[PDB]
């Protein structure tokens, strides 16, 4: 079974401030999302994330991650993640899931 | 059946101006492509797009999309998509296709 | 069989200078990596690369590739690839592999 | 996609006399059936036949075939086949179908 | 996931008498077995039964079934089934299971 | 990958006498065959045997096996197997093979 989707994170004004887990990064923000598979798997599927949209301010550095936290049989937690003085106007992450 | 490929869009001087479908975007351009599968599927495969190359002018904002329009059993329409005063010297999109 | 992973290339000070294979590019650098599949395939799997992290200096152009050189049944060679006066502080490439 | 089923041919009084295609066999009879897959394939599936029931007269020889004539993407023609003075009171053929 | 196996029912002296569920059959006996998959499925697999061994008394009729009662994700109930004055010295049933 | 086939053993006059491996059986004969897959597997496929043809003398007992000896990635050894005073005029074994 193979399922796909898209996560439009949008502007980072709507993102939440989260506490840094990398000592070299501060002001870490993130639009986290809990995606739920249409047809649940039984064993957690292999998931790939892909950044398919980007709108980032040119005066400051491009700092972006498409972070994949975890994958259960039922869904997964992933996020658009930026930090420092980066400004993200728009970030979308397409994803895919395959059983095994 | 799993098939893969790469779409080298190149410079955006060669891209076509297309009419905006987002009210907040103007001067929308796009290198659209109609990809045809080597071995045709019968049911449309799940397709994932991935931006694997980028060459973008630093003086203006990074505005890029890897837009996936549609997927038939026989192929798919996707594009490199930029807008406003963004300059893209180079954009390649790797893709993958899986039956179900 | 489906396998996944992540290649953290990091800062490009640690990358090697490699000779250009594109006449229009100079000062080409690259963090090449030889990934080996946990469970070896017998026929080379289809592999997709995806840039899931980016930290790039804003004063100079964003020049990055997620280059996929080759794929054997046993593994694959891929790299984070930049050139000219681009500065990459961070680049991670998530990948996926599927038999056929 | 994998589909299964069962073909209860029953008594051979209800079977049709068909013309022999083997010179050494006469009085060839056969309960032919045209099975149609619930979910049609696109490429013809590999089909296996299996005799899972038998009720045959002991005074004469056991002559039975589970003959698989053809396989389209949409279904298949198979039959319970006996000949000479064999008497079949009952013959069921379970089958399986797999894409490829 | 595909799993296989074999059910040696042996002599029908060791089989249990079970009550007939077909009005035209009496003295119905059966060696029922509850098979459990090594690697459990999550959705019940499609199962095919196949009689791969037979030792039957020639003075009386060949009456045998390879009956497939049910299939759960975890296993299945099947049996060697005979009736009337048939004598089975030996009956083995090979089986196969496939997810979907 | 799924492959199928048929093994027509024919008359048991052409079968070889082989030494018994069951103490209760004598005069054991067998038409052994070494089948080779058209498209070789890499891991040995799961193989199911099925008797789809039978022509057996009624005056003596039906003693038949569809014996599956071994399965390599490249093929398999199986046989039509009878013993004692059983006479087999005809025995065909259909088979199927699936990767995993
Ligand atoms: C989904 O995400 C939210 C937000 O972080 C979290 O609180 C919740 O526990 C997640 N769901 C699961 C399955 O844990
Ligand atoms: C492929 O793309 C072109 C350009 O947009 C379009 O005109 C054509 O209709 C497309 N093909 C299909 C299958 O519609
Ligand atoms: C893996 O990468 C290294 C570095 O480029 C290379 O020398 C080596 O030959 C590669 N391994 C294989 C399988 O060729
Ligand atoms: C199905 O079987 C019948 C009976 O032999 C035959 O006439 C018919 O043509 C078959 N259908 C197809 C698909 O040809
Ligand atoms: C397995 O078979 C036995 C014997 O008929 C039966 O009692 C038991 O309930 C079966 N197990 C399941 C899963 O029901
Ligand atoms: C195939 O069968 C023959 C006859 O028994 C045997 O001699 C031969 O060794 C077999 N081939 C393999 C792969 O061992």
Q: Which of D70, D8, D78, D5 is nearest to D38 (CA)?
A: D5
Which ligand is nearest the CA of A72, by number?
Answer: 1
- Taking alpha carbons only, the member of D7, D29, D31 closest to residue D18 is D29
Q: Whose CA is nearest to atom 2 of ligand 4?
A: D34
Give CA C100 to chain center in angstroms.
Answer: 23
Q: What is the Cα–Cα distance from A11 to C86, expressed in whole angstroms? A: 26
Give the domain ranges of chain A: 1-100
Nearest to A41 by CA among A76, A70, A73: A73
Would you say C84 is a known binding-site residue? yes
- Encoded tokens for D47: 């089909």
Bridge partners of F82, per DSSP, are F29
Q: How far from chain centre, in Å, is Cα A12?
A: 12
| DSSP 8-class letter at A44 | P
Establish whether residue E34 lines the binding site of ligand 5, counting it when its CB lies within 6 angstroms of any ligand atom.
yes
What HEC string does chain B produce? CEEEEEEECCCCCCCEECCCCCCCCCCCEEEEEEEECCCCCCCCCEEEEEEEEEEECCCCCEEEEEEEEEECCCEEEEEEEECCCCCEEEEEEEEEEECC
Binding site annotation covers C8? no
Best residue for ligand 4 mutational test, from D16, D71, D77, D78 (most atoms within 8 Å of Cβ) = D77
The CA-atom distances, in angstroms, between C35 and each of A10, A93, F38, F84 are 34, 25, 32, 60
Contact D61, F56 (CB under 8 A): yes
- Euclidean distance between CA atoms B87 and B64, whole angstroms: 10
CA C24 to chain centre: 20
Q: B18, B21, B81, B86: which is closest to B51 by C-alpha?
A: B81
How far is Cα A54 from Cα D53, in angstroms, rounded to an integer? 64
Residue C91 and residue C55 in contact, taking contact as beta carbons nearer than 8 Å: yes
F63 in a labelled binding site: yes
Partner residues linked to F32 by β-bridges = F79
Please name the member of C59, C60, C64 whose beta carbon is closest to the beta carbon of B54: C64
Residue burial F52-85, b: 16+ Cβ < 10 Å; e: rest: bbbbbebeebbbbbbbbeebeeebbebbbbbbee
> E77 CB less than 6 Å from ligand 5?
yes
Note whether B61 contacts A62, CB cutoff 8 Å: no
Q: Per the CB < 8 Å rule, is E53 touching F65?
A: yes
Burial E21-37, CB ≥16 within 10 A → b, else e:
eeeeeeebbbbbeebeb
Interface probe with C: pick from A47, A57, A65, A67, most Cβ of C within 10 Å: A65
H helical segments located in chain D: none
Distant-in-sequence, close-in-space partners of A72: CB < 8 Å, separation ≥ 6: A44
Angle at A57 between CA A52 and CA A59, to 5 degrees: 140
- Give C65's contacts in chain B (Cβ within 8 Å): 52-54, 92
Q: Does domain C1-100 have CATH number 1.10.10.10?
A: no
**Residue E98, C-beta contacts closer than 8 angstroms, at least 6 positions apart:** D2, D96, D98, E1, E2, E45, E46, F98
**Measured CA angle at E82 (ends E76, E86), to 5 deg:** 160
- Cα–Cα distance for residue pair C52/F56, rounded to 1 Å: 68
Q: Which of A59, A62, A63 sits opposite C62 (nearest CB)?
A: A62
Closest partner residue to E58 (CB to CB) among F48, F51, F58 is F58
Chain D residues in contact with E48 (beta carbon < 8 A): 4, 48, 50, 94-96
Interface of B with D (CB under 8 A): 42-43
Instruction: Give the DSSP H or E segment for D35.
Output: strand D29-36
Closest CA to F48 of A65, E95, A72: E95
HSE-up of residue C10 (Cα within 13 Å, Cβ side): 6
Which pair of tokens denotes residue F35?
């089948």
Give the burial class of F90: count Cβ atoms within 10 A of its Cβ; 0-12 exposed, 13-18 middle, 19 or more buried: buried
């Amino acid at each position: 079974r193979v399922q796909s989707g898209k996560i439009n994170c949008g502007d980072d004004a709507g993102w939440a401030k989260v506490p840094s887990d990398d000592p070299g990064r501060d002001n870490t923000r993130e639009l986290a999302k809990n995606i739920t598979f249409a047809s649940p798997y039984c064993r957690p599927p292999v998931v790939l994330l892909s950044i398919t949209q980007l709108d980032v301010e040119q005066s400051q550095n491009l700092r972006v991650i498409a972070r994949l936290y975890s994958v259960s049989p039922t869904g997964f937690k992933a996020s658009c993640y930026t930090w420092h003085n980066t400004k993200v106007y728009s970030m979308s992450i397409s994803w895919i899931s395959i059983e095994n």
